[PDB]
Amino acid sequence: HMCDAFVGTWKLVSSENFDDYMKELGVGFATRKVAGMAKPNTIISVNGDVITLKTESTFKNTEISFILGQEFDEVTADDRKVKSTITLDGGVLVHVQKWDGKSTTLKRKREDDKLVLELVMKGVTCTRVYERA
Ligand SMILES: CCCCCCCCCCCCCCCC(=O)O
Numbered sequence: 001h002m003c004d005a006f007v008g009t010w011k012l013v014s015s016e017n018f019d020d021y022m023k024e025l026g027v028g029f030a031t032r033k034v035a036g037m038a039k040p041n042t043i044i045s046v047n048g049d050v051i052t053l054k055t056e057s058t059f060k061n062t063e064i065s066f067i068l069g070q071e072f073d074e075v076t077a078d079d080r081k082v083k084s085t086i087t088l089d090g091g092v093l094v095h096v097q098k099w100d101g102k103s104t105t106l107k108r109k110r111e112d113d114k115l116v117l118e119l120v121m122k123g124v125t126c127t128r129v130y131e132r133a
Helices: 018-024 031-038
Strands: 008-016 041-047 048-056 061-067 072-075 081-089 092-099 102-111 114-121 124-132
Touching: 018 031, 018 114, 018 124, 061 072, 081 102
Parallel strands: none
Antiparallel strands: 008 041, 008 124, 041 048, 048 061, 072 081, 081 092, 092 102, 102 114, 114 124
16 A cells, blocks of 8 residues: 555646756756646556556656666656666655766655655756646
8 A cells, every 4th residue: 555645647737947957957948848838647556566657748758667665777758868766755755866977856745635746956946736637
């Protein structure tokens, strides 16, 4: 029952500082424009110990499957080749990506009826709020 509160289909409702976050990742002008326009859905499912997280939009579709604590190689929506580990820390799903001496964190928490995604790179924090579809 590790991740029960996260399971389902979620839709983006608000975004704060995403452009700045994408700049910190090195995302170029055209991609930042088209990515910022996106209204994704995030679909989280669980089969035993395997969690699947899909992110679907008109810009890109991504899909990762993982076991908590077990590192995996990920190719992100902006085409970074990263080493990823996802853990549950006190009810928060913490996703760390490492590449090229750099790191970013993607943390997901349940707050009221929302799924709140915090993206942090260096000094920059973006918050993406999702609600159930
Ligand atoms: C997948 C639709 C959003 C578009 C992102 C594509 C270009 C930038 C990718 C940025 C890093 C991944 C950000 C996660 C954002 C989110 O799940 O809401």
